[PDB]
């Protein structure tokens, strides 16, 4: 996104020198709902499915918020040895239908 930045060159004597300190004050409050920026195109959350101390599921939700563009993603999972995984139970369901990863 096109972002505008204000530069405070500390190497400039005309900005900060021995005669004064610099204290940048910014006025910012939470914008109203109308002025809120759009949600980022990619975000994800992770959680554990089920209850008890015998079995469960490590579920990851991957959100694509782009209205019309689909992009690949690369998911990396590292699970310790005491959480014995069964790869035959690995399901990737997007929009309610099975999704086949390009590379597993």
């Amino acid at each position: 996104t096109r972002k505008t930045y204000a530069i405070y060159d500390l190497l400039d004597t005309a900005m900060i020198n021995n005669s004064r300190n610099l204290n940048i004050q910014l006025k910012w409050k939470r914008p109203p709902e109308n002025e809120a920026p759009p949600v980022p195109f990619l975000h994800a959350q992770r959680y554990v499915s089920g209850y008890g101390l015998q079995k469960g599921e490590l579920s990851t939700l991957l959100y694509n918020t782009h209205p019309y563009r689909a992009f690949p993603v690369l998911l990396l999972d590292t699970v310790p040895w005491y959480l014995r995984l069964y790869v035959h139970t690995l399901t990737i369901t997007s929009k309610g239908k099975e999704n086949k990863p390009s590379y597993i």
């Binding site: 209850y51 101390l53 015998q54 079995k55 014995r84 995984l85 069964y86 790869v87 035959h88 597993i104």
Partner: protein, 420 residues
């Protein structure tokens, strides 16, 4: 026979109904019914791993032999049909084995009756064809309709397959067939290491059937024993070497036999090894695991000493000891030696402490799921509750087996010396 067909039909119908029920998933995940070496989910996982190019023995989930993976590669479909067929085949093998054993023991009894070797008045202890008519049918009925076996086959555990192998070993041994008995014993030793202890009962029964005196000075005994031992060892070596080539690697030997002998999982079971090694000082871990795995093979020789002339009871006691002291015991393993109870039900009059032990076994079995749920899902119980249940269950099993052994000894003593 018609009653055998009726029992087979009833058992198959019950198994199919439980297969199509909503309790199949609940049963499939029971720690009492499945084990790290026998779970069906692990078979599916090890089959799926091969599709990814990953050797199934590189992980810590798959612990089954290459023969199982070859069988279930072709037969991944119709798995429930496969397990129902294995249960029916075990029932058939046990039925015919016991039917032949009854004839053999009746011929022996008639021989010592003609020789008047028994006591003058032991008519009550005398076995009659009328009482032995339905023993083969009851043997197949105590296995097919056992709740343990029904659960073990609905959960789709390879324990049913290993039980079928042991049953066919018993049948072939009872029907002569030294070659087939050696092959089936090698196959049983392939799936689980412990069934190698049945070598002594099989050899003793074969020698008795072939009328070779089991004496140190005897040479025919040594010749036949050497042939049987060589046949068994060759059949096991050939199986190991052949199944090496399935994945062209030796990694299955650790994942199966080192798993069986070293107990790395420490996952709850009806056994006595899960907690002993979870709650254990690492100083004596090797010593105590060595002692506990010696325990299974400990009694075969002294039992052979006492039961030299009674090899089938020796085999039954050995099967029971294996099922009790296995590293990863299963209710399916326990159900194999409870199919022999109708054979030894003529020992009932000399059986003490039968009601209490049966009640204890029933209580422990019903209490396994309840206390497991309280510990794991409810959270209001510890592992101590489940450990206590396993202790009580195994004590009941041990006392029941020793009780049948005592009844057998009492009957032999009365037959020899005189009942009052």
């Amino acid at each position: 026979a018609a009653p055998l067909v009726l029992v087979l039909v009833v058992a198959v119908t019950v198994r199919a109904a439980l297969f199509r029920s909503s309790l199949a998933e609940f049963i499939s995940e029971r720690v009492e019914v499945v084990s790290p070496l026998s779970s069906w989910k692990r078979v599916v996982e090890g089959l799926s791993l091969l599709d990814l190019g990953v050797s199934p023995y590189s992980g810590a989930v798959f612990h089954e032999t290459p023969l199982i993976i070859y069988l279930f590669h072709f037969l991944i479909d119709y798995a429930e049909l496969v397990f129902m067929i294995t249960d029916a085949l075990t029932a058939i093998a046990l039925y015919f084995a016991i039917q032949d054993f009854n004839k053999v023991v009746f011929k022996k009894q008639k021989l010592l009756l003609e020789l008047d070797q028994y006591a003058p008045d032991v008519a009550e202890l005398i076995r009659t064809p009328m009482e032995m008519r339905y023993i083969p049918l009851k043997v197949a009925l105590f296995y097919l309709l056992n709740p343990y076996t029904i659960l073990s086959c609905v959960a789709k555990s390879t324990c049913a397959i290993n039980n079928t192998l042991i049953a066919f070993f018993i049948l072939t041994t009872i029907k002569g067939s030294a070659f087939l008995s050696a092959i089936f014993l090698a196959l049983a030793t392939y799936q689980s290491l412990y069934p190698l202890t049945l070598f002594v009962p099989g050899l003793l029964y074969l020698l008795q059937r072939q009328y070779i005196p089991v004496k140190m000075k005897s040479k025919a005994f040594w010749i036949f024993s050497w042939e049987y031992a060589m046949m068994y060892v060759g059949s096991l070596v050939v199986i190991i070497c052949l199944s090496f080539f399935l994945l062209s690697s030796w990694d299955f030997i650790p994942a199966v036999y080192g798993f069986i002998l070293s107990v790395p999982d420490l996952t709850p079971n009806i056994g006595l090894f899960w907690y002993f090694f979870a709650e254990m000082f690492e100083h004596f871990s090797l010593f105590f695991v060595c002692v506990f795995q010696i325990n299974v093979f400990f009694y075969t020789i002294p039992l052979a000493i006492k039961l030299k002339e009674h090899p089938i009871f020796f085999m039954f006691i050995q099967i029971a000891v294996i099922a009790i002291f296995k590293s990863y015991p299963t209710v399916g393993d326990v159900a194999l030696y409870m199919a022999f109870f109708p054979v030894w039900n003529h020992l009932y009059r000399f059986l003490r402490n039968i009601f209490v032990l049966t009640c204890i076994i029933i209580v422990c079995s019903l209490l396994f799921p309840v206390l497991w749920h309280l510990w794991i899902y409810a959270g209001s119980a510890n592992s101590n509750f489940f450990y206590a249940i396993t202790l009580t269950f195994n004590v009941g099993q041990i006392l029941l087996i020793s009780d049948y052994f005592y009844a057998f000894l009492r009957r032999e003593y009365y037959l020899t010396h005189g009942l009052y």
